[PDB]
Amino acid sequence: LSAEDKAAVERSKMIDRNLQEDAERDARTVKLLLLGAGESGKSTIVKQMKITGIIETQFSFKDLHFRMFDVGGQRSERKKWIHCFEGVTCIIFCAALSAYDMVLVEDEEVNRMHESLHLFNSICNHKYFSTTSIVLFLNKKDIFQEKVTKVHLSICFPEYTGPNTFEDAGNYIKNQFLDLNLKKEDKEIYSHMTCATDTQNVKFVFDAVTDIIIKENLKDCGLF
Amino acid sequence: ELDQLRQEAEQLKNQIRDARKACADATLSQITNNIDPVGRIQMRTRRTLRGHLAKIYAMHWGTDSRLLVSASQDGKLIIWDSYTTNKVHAIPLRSSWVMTCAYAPSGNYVACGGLDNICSIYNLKTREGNVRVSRELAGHTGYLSCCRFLDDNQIVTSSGDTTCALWDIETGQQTTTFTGHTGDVMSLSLAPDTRLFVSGACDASAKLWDVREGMCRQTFTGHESDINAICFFPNGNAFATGSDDATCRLFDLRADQELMTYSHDNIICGITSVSFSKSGRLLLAGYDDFNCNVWDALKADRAGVLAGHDNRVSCLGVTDDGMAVATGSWDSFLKIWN
Amino acid sequence: ASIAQARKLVEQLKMEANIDRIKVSKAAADLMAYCEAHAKEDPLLTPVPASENPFR
Amino acid sequence: GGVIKSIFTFVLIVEFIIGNLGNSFIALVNCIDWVKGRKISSVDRILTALAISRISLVWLIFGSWCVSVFFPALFATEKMFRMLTNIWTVINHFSVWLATGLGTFYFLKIANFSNSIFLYLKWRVKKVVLVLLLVTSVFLFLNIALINIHINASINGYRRNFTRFSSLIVLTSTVFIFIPFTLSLAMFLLLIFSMWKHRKKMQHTVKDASTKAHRGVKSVITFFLLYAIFSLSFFISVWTSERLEENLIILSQVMGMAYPSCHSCVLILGNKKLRQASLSVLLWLR
């Protein structure tokens, strides 16, 4: 090598060292992907959890620096850029409990609860999302509590036969979302009913993310 | 009357089909049946580039065919050196999620676009010695899928809003938008004469455009899934398309029809990046099964398998002199083959 | 309304339906001529001796 | 006496077969995976190294028994006794510290804390385990030197003129094998503490099942209590009990075969990829 080539090698080594240090810093930061239907509580989750392009929310909890990415903007068929988010640790899903009796304005035949159900079915059984765990947030808990007395859930689900009580209806919605997980072996779904005012949503995400990290560590070691 | 317009469109489509059939007398196979076989093309990983911490989503060469730019999902745009493994530059990107990268033909600028919806131009040559942002091209309402450099002042950009636009750098606005697609535009390829470019999109239809006039001359449909890659023939009068249907198609501009389909029964995985050789006889396609399959363009016979990646081959780049084929995959490495 | 979009589509189809075409055999011959004329100068297809190869 | 010697010989044979089976299972399944190009982690590479070390150790101990029965006259020169002691120290150090390094790998990846040093080790776990096995060379050299000194003293006593020398080298080896045993025990205890804290946190919030999957331990803890009580019984018998010198050699080899044999039955159970391979083999059998 010559002196200029030696300087080039030194520069390349420095760039590699800086990239390695960047990797060091990003070890504890953790990458979440936020998804949900229209007016399903996504804004409520972001506003709680802090306190065109894709939006990024950065927030800290006991040395875990979570970067959550929201792709509500840039609406497409979503089968074309989803492979970017394959490496995310967790999909924070937002589903509106109060959407069972409120249908889509564009198509009243299409219930918004059913739209959320279908889009969860797409997310939980997807080519690049086989291993990514999902943290499930049923928002509008107060609104759903009020509406469980008003509208019978049978008008939304033909299979609904239970009493129109807040609890049983809540668990029924929960199962309607969870048993979409055909391969309930690798991916795990953590379901929480948030009420648009709960302050432990970030606390819930913290231990869900630590649990997912431990699960992936066991999987890499093979002990799981 | 909307029904009248639909009937007129159907009649015109029938007329186009009739003309296309009339102009077609002998398929490319019949003429190429007597051509010599290309042989078994074998390639080795001459150089492996390491330093990316995420999946490589784009890679482009330079005019000199010596330098190379790679875009990963960690927000790094490393300008490599294929002659000697050396990181010339490392651009920290504000928008980590990057789907496309480009190198200016003069070699003074690069570009990066992703779900951010912006073609960030970077100034490689500068008095301060570090690479910074030239300007932020924020006019697209969809994700940035591909971008290529017409000149140092003109960049052609494709986006997920089913449109493409020519930008003028010194003003930073859409000089001329391209509209007519109904699906996510994935890849574009500027022709050698820097006048026409083909934009294959997600509606299984690739549309030719002329930059100066700004209106679509030809439309090609032979596919059944989203076209995820495109590359002009080196002559500039033909181009290949790779789609999710696991088939590559070569179209000729003059006849305005598909010529050959590069499909195999063992291939189920859809193509992601398609590039040609210097002479155009060799068609390199980066398939979805962690491999790059090397196809003879004139005769639909596979002639090589650049199987050296542990993850999906996302970007494919063939040197201007045809001396190297860079294959960047999702295993966070780039491999130069020759 | 959508009538304008339909009219634009029909106009575009009119432009696509009036441009001249050449026979596919002639295009195949042209591609053959290009491939053969630059076959000697294609390194990937015809490996260039390692002395001139910059990736030794 | 004779009956206990025959029992020791039979159980030594059984331990040889089971060690061969376990080590071969691990080694050949990993080699088959490597030969046709699946993704190879670091835990499987460490498992390959541990398996080859253990199969070499069991081959050395079986050759010791073979020369014990086939050619006692070869023990009569004591030169190959010196050779076998040296190689036994070397390979036993390699195998024990390889198991300790695998435990370190597990502790560094599975556990989670806020400590900075732990974060450094977790990020560079590969270099950490490599440098640990590299810096075990000083311990290995010290053990070779100390055991060589003990045997040189034994022959010097024999030349001037044994069971007492054997007992003292046994004690020294026990101390310098407790040195890595203590590290493994402390590391596993810290891992258990971390998992208990994680269990409490998942009990407080939404829930645990896979924590039992890490602590599969269907027979791991059952193994270790039996091993501890057996080792204590043998230690006491050598220390004070009568008529152990006659069958000292065979008992020593069978007790040495412990980790070599049984302990990979344990890795098979713990390793889910290896247990999937074992389940496939069992299905092929039936």
Added chain:
Amino acid sequence: VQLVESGGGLVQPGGSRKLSCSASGFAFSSFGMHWVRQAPEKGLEWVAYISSGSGTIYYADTVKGRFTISRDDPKNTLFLQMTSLRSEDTAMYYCVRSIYYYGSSPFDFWGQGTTLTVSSSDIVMTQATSSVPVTPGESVSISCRSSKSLLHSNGNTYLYWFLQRPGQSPQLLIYRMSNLASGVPDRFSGSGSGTAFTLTISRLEAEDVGVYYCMQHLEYPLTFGAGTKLEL
């Protein structure tokens, strides 16, 4: 970009000092920073060289061990600590930034420099032309000879041309013996056979008036030429 320096002055023989070069307007932490001298009525001689991150340290044989060079990235400042100074060190000291790749321009910028007054195997490169009477509008070439062939195995020749206007600092004209430096008129050009070189100049103006030097960058004892002077 600016590299105005400080320090130096009138010192006794066998003294101590700390020369400083202050950076501004460029990424100091990424550049390679050199120290170049100039005897009061003679040419330049390379003295010291810090690298980015201080990984690489080099000194001239004359100042080997005697001088120490160090950089301060947070404050963007260069240092050249000097002890046991001698009379040969009376020089027009410069701090010179050289970036670290091919396709790039080493020795692109030169500082203003500080004055120092003292009381009572390397590839040699010579320019025997010395004094050249010149007139505006006339093409004139400057020749430089190298003791060792400057064509490295990588096919990249290492020769750098500088022009020093009276009472100014050297400015890079040609890098790699052929490429033109930024902000340099297209009149300048370079050609040669790898051992003998010429610096062809087109129609001359007042800017071209000065003294020209040639440096090799192959072997790190970078030796400048004697200095061909162009008087009008």
